[PDB]
Amino acid sequence: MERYENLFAQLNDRREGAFVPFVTLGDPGIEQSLKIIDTLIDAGADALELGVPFSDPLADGPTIQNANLRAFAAGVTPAQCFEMLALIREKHPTIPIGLLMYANLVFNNGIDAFYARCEQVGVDSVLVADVPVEESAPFRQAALRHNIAPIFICPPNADDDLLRQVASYGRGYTYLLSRSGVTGAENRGALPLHHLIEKLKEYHAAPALQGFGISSPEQVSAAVRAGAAGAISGSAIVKIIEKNLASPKQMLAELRSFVSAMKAASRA
Amino acid sequence: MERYENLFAQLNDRREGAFVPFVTLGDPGIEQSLKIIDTLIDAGADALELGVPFSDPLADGPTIQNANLRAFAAGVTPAQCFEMLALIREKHPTIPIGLLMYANLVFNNGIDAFYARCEQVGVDSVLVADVPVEESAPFRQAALRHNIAPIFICPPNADDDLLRQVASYGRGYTYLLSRSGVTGAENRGALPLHHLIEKLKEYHAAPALQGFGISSPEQVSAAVRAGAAGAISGSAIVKIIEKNLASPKQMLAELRSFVSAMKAASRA
Amino acid sequence: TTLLNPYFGEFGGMYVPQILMPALNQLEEAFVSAQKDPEFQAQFADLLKNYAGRPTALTKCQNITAGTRTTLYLKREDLLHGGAHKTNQVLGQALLAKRMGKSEIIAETGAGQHGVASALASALLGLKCRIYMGAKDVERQSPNVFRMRLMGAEVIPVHSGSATLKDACNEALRDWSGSYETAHYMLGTAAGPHPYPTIVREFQRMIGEETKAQILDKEGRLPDAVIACVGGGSNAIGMFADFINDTSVGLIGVEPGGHGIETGEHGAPLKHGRVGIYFGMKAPMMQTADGQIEESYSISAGLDFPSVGPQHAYLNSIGRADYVSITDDEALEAFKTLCRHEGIIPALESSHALAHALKMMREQPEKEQLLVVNLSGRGDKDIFTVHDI
Amino acid sequence: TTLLNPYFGEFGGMYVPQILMPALNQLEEAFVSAQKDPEFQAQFADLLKNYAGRPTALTKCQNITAGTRTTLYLKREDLLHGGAHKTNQVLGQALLAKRMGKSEIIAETGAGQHGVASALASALLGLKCRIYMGAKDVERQSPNVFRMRLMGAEVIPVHSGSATLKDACNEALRDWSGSYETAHYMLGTAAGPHPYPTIVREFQRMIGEETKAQILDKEGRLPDAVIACVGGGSNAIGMFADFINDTSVGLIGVEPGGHGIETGEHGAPLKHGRVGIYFGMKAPMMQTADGQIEESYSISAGLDFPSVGPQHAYLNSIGRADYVSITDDEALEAFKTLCRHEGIIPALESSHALAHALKMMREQPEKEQLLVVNLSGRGDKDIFTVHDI
Numbered sequence A, B: 001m002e003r004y005e006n007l008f009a010q011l012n013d014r015r016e017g018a019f020v021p022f023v024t025l026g027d028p029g030i031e032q033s034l035k036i037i038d039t040l041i042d043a044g045a046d047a048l049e050l051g052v053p054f055s056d057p058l059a060d061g062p063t064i065q066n067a068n069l070r071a072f073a074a075g076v077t078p079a080q081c082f083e084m085l086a087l088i089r090e091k092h093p094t095i096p097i098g099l100l101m102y103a104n105l106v107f108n109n110g111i112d113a114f115y116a117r118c119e120q121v122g123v124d125s126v127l128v129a130d131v132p133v134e135e136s137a138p139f140r141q142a143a144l145r146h147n148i149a150p151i152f153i154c155p156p157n158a159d160d161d162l163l164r165q166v167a168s169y170g171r172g173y174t175y176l177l178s179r180s181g182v183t184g185a186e187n188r189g190a191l192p193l194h195h196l197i198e199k200l201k202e203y204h205a206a207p208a209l210q211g212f213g214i215s216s217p218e219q220v221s222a223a224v225r226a227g228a229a230g231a232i233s234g235s236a237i238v239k240i241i242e243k244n245l246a247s248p249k250q251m252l253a254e255l256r257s258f259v260s261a262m263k264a265a266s267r268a
Numbered sequence C, D: 001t002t003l004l005n006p007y008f009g010e011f012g013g014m015y016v017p018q019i020l021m022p023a024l025n026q027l028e029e030a031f032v033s034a035q036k037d038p039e040f041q042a043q044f045a046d047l048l049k050n051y052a053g054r055p056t057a058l059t060k061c062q063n064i065t066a067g068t069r070t071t072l073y074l075k076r077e078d079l080l081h082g083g084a085h086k087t088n089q090v091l092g093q094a095l096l097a098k099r100m101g102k103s104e105i106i107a108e109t110g111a112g113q114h115g116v117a118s119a120l121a122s123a124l125l126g127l128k129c130r131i132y133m134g135a136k137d138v139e140r141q142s143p144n145v146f147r148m149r150l151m152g153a154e155v156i157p158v159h160s161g162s163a164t165l166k167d168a169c170n171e172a173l174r175d176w177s178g179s180y181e182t183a184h185y186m187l188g189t190a191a192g193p194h195p196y197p198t199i200v201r202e203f204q205r206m207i208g209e210e211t212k213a214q215i216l217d218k219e220g221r222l223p224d225a226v227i228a229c230v231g232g233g234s235n236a237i238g239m240f241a242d243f244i245n246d247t248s249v250g251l252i253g254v255e256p257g258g259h260g261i262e263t264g265e266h267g268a269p270l271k272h273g274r275v276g277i278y279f280g281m282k283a284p285m286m287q288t289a290d291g292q293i294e295e296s297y298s299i300s301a302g303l304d305f306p307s308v309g310p311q312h313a314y315l316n317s318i319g320r321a322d323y324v325s326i327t328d329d330e331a332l333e334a335f336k337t338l339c340r341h342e343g344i345i346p347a348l349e350s351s352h353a354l355a356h357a358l359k360m361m362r363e364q365p366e367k368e369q370l371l372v373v374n375l376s377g378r379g380d381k382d383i384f385t386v387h388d389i
């Protein structure tokens, strides 16, 4: 499929940026997570980034660490995540779905088999957080064999060689990191380095989504203005889950309000 | 004075050995200790060996260690011991009185001053347990200047050189150790090595008293038969004190019975 | 692109977030430069000699081997300053940190020995040290925590995940991901992403180099085998390295068998785990069926790696080194035996290596064999663990 | 009659019961013979090198002395096997015991370090070891008691007197008085009756001999002063001995000042006690007005001699050595300072010596002085004492 390509073409036609929430699958349980995801979509999410709970999420700060822990407390496994993903796709045929993976979960049952399962359930992209471009060959090859976009990361400090590799090897979107460090709303990054955004376009990279520390509408607007195709927000969304664990209905209302506001900021 | 010389002459006239109990001064208190000592004498003690309580009695086994501790629990000091000694002599003008001392108590206030105090209260001999003949010069010199007999020890293993020194340097009596080790009734020594007893006589030593482990009449008799002038018993006497702490009258009765039996064994 | 090979056969690599790659490349560059720099080498040697107390003794056991044809020597890393071999490589890494112009050190620790080693090196060399330690480890390692604090290190409890060593490893990397411009990550074993397995080996290889010189002096020949315990792999690779090209010398690594391999309560991933990718490397590890990382169990807290250095996995794969396991009970018996027959109290970690040597001797008592056990540390720390049993 | 002089000026002697004189004469004879025997010397040197880890390092402090004209080195007896200098002389005395054909060892201990040293030497060398320890010390030194037991020694609590070190000293002598035909009394310091002060000095003198060679190598000249703590006197006389004839080298011994000399709660008999006769010697001691022996108080249990070796009293009397005191609080500050600025955890005993060196530097910071402190032991044992404060 070509779900990101179709999305970005549609958004470009409307001079609009993408807003892309992240949540952990199965946080705080399978049924509530499915409701959360439906709420994100109804509230205007253009695409999703979905984490499979992992024991050792070493690119994540405390907010998302705690989401992984809640999912484990609910007994969530990768197999259950795939069941969730198949159902999400059955409900929502066009929204791009990206996974946030750690390498061991991809390598565990065999790399090729993992990407084959992604294709079967209708995932569009996979970002393996602890595989740098230097180690990426078997992952990107398997992704492409199964019509999955492999997502690569452009750090703010990226040199020309790295920009060329990310441009060549990635598909779907290019992840533009706002800053060093780990995920977290408590730590705001920079405006998309215009120089990086322009070099990526020069090298015909997949459209850029800025992520890390994106918690406010004003940051979404600024990302798009700087030339990114959109913005990803994780911790800010997950914080709403955490705050409202005891109040599942209020949780969905607050998620809807927040996502609506973030998506509004992406519009021309 | 010449109290040992007079005693041994009197005993020789009667073909009799000496029986000499040891107790710790002030065990279990000053008043009871004075009564104990009067009982020993009335029951037939020929001479006394009296210990001044010391913190570190390293020639003594548990029985006499515990006597020292009881005297300390009663607050007994060397000055109080000297007061006791003056009174004992005022009551009993002829009985030889020997002290069992550790070196620090003699050296503390000055060696000469210690022996001067002994002369003033009417002590006859001093045995300094932790001063071997090799270190004895200032002690024996001070003793003799104050008409005090310095007592030396003949171990069972004594070579000829040592026998000659003990014979030359000692006065009053020669202490014949029954065995190696420390004081105690629980450990019986040998018969007075006849060879030692005879060599001491050859060298004109002061008459021998056998001590260490002497707890029974049969040992007193055997010591005298082997050629010793008598026998000393400490732990066996002190054990009677220890056993009867709660019963001071019974204590005196048992001491009287034991001493009478031990003295009877010394008679021809 | 790298200067050195990041792999040992299929094992190893640099499985870190992209943001950390410049830090690893910088470290590799500084290490390659330092290894050619006679001034760096002289400074490192000076610290090892005059501060740490190298060379360490090589002690012939005679009482332990009486009535057999085994001759046993112990390489006395227990006598190094700090009481374990860890001191060697922390001093080298502290000097690398300074070479790169870094003023801050991050370290992980489980049992606490690496934390103490890191704090002592940082105190000596003017670095500001922060140490991550799983909250469960903090609770049970009060002595080591106090030592770290006395030496001026910040100890940061980690409450995430299982609140043990792997969680502290993660936290150290999360911190470094944001702080690499000013801080060096002082990794505590011969594992993690390249270049750490290589650096740690090179900064521990004096163990084997000295052993070789000492055994040649005393016996006029090389050992039949050298035997070392394997937590993450540093003391073992330090003993093995200088013998790898001496094809006659057996290399035997001893993983903790815990309550017994069959119980699943062990720390023997090389022989009884499954290859995975975690903590920056492809290596055998303790993992669930689904690929979640698990803990290693051992009576010895210091053998509490849930994986193993990639060079050990490689040496195993080609048959150059053999790996075995020793249970808690076997280690305890070796501890007691060394105390009673040689007057040396060994670390419970090291007791695993000694236990396997004792088995080699006892199983085949008329086999002529010259063995060296790496006595990686002293066992003062273990007396109450052993007492309670 | 003796072969060697039992006195150092008026101090020393052989104030034991007559029954023990043959044992002391036998020991003296065996020692004089051993000192002329190249085989004995070679065996002792071999154990010191290959078992204990000599020579020990001489470490230059630079961080501690920054901004002053003091240069400070530490002689690292903390790195000896066992963690204190005591190991040197127990190995020598164990070899004497064997030379005399004895199979059993008696030892006294207070803090427990001598007991552990005696037990380790006995385990190595095939001797049956029994250790007397005051019951109060047994209660408060569980770690050391367990170490002694692990090494196969019998630990015998002493309940007599004050149930502390002096009482254990007495009990050891009472046992020896009956057992000397088969047992050697392994006295734990440079005190007691001749020949022990002499033997212990000679079996510790490698401390000073090495220090001299090391300082000449590093500085090209002798120290201005060498500084050592004084419990009974062994580590100090071991450092001092080889410098006694180097008249320019200051010898400074540091007694424990406890809560302060004025409080009476100290362990400083050399400077603040009164000459007495006890434990086989004439020496300054802690005693009541009437001459009863008293205890020494210090935060450091190892400085818990209620007297001092006679050679120290002699060196003081002639002015060849100077003796000072350091309080609990001063020792604690030195402990903390060394941990934080040099990454070395010193024994609280040794911390007294370091504290005095720190005072020498701080009081006169522009005085040019090259100082060596004998770091007699490591302070792992002390972390909980220091923690609780």
Ligand SMILES: O=P(O)(O)OCCNS(=O)(=O)c1ccc(OC(F)(F)F)cc1
Pocket (backbone or CB within 6 Å): A022, A049, A050, A059, A060, A064, A100, A127, A128, A129, A130, A153, A175, A177, A182, A183, A184, A185, A211, A212, A213, A214, A232, A233, A234, A235, A236, C017, C018, C019
């Ligand atoms: O809004 P924040 O700060 O929580 O950021 C949310 C990011 N979620 S995500 O899945 O895009 C994401 C993307 C990349 C990550 O690590 C990597 F860069 F190393 F690959 C981790 C998470």
Ligand SMILES: O=P(O)(O)OCCNS(=O)(=O)c1ccc(OC(F)(F)F)cc1
Pocket (backbone or CB within 6 Å): B022, B049, B050, B059, B060, B064, B100, B127, B128, B129, B130, B153, B175, B177, B182, B183, B184, B185, B211, B212, B213, B214, B232, B233, B234, B235, B236, D017, D018, D019
């Ligand atoms: O009957 P026992 O076994 O208790 O022996 C009692 C002995 N009491 S004593 O005062 O003669 C006495 C004599 C000598 C002593 O030690 C020395 F030999 F070293 F000098 C100790 C006590």
Ligand SMILES: *Cc1c(COP(=O)(O)O)cnc(C)c1O
Pocket (backbone or CB within 6 Å): C083, C084, C085, C086, C113, C114, C188, C189, C190, C229, C230, C231, C232, C233, C234, C235, C236, C302, C303, C347, C349, C350, C376, C377, C378
């Ligand atoms: C830490 C430690 C180990 C295990 O770590 P390696 O990296 O495998 O050497 C072994 N022995 C001791 C004494 C240790 O402190």
Ligand SMILES: *Cc1c(COP(=O)(O)O)cnc(C)c1O
Pocket (backbone or CB within 6 Å): D083, D084, D085, D086, D113, D114, D188, D189, D190, D229, D230, D231, D232, D233, D234, D235, D236, D302, D303, D347, D349, D350, D376, D377, D378
């Ligand atoms: C025992 C001990 C001392 C004191 O004893 P000395 O005989 O005076 O040396 C000093 N330092 C340490 C570390 C000790 O263990």
Ligand SMILES: [Cl-]
Pocket (backbone or CB within 6 Å): A167, A168, A169, A170, A171, A204, A205, A206
């Ligand atoms: Cl592309």
Ligand SMILES: [Cl-]
Pocket (backbone or CB within 6 Å): B167, B168, B169, B170, B171, B204, B205, B206
């Ligand atoms: Cl005479």
Ligand SMILES: [Cs+]
Pocket (backbone or CB within 6 Å): C065, C066, C067, C068, C069, C070, C071
């Ligand atoms: Cs052998």
Ligand SMILES: [Cs+]
Pocket (backbone or CB within 6 Å): C230, C231, C232, C255, C256, C267, C268, C269, C296, C303, C304, C305, C306, C307, C308
């Ligand atoms: Cs392991």
Ligand SMILES: [Cs+]
Pocket (backbone or CB within 6 Å): D065, D066, D067, D068, D069, D070, D071
């Ligand atoms: Cs200086």
Ligand SMILES: [Cs+]
Pocket (backbone or CB within 6 Å): D230, D231, D232, D255, D256, D267, D268, D269, D296, D303, D304, D305, D306, D307, D308
């Ligand atoms: Cs003292």
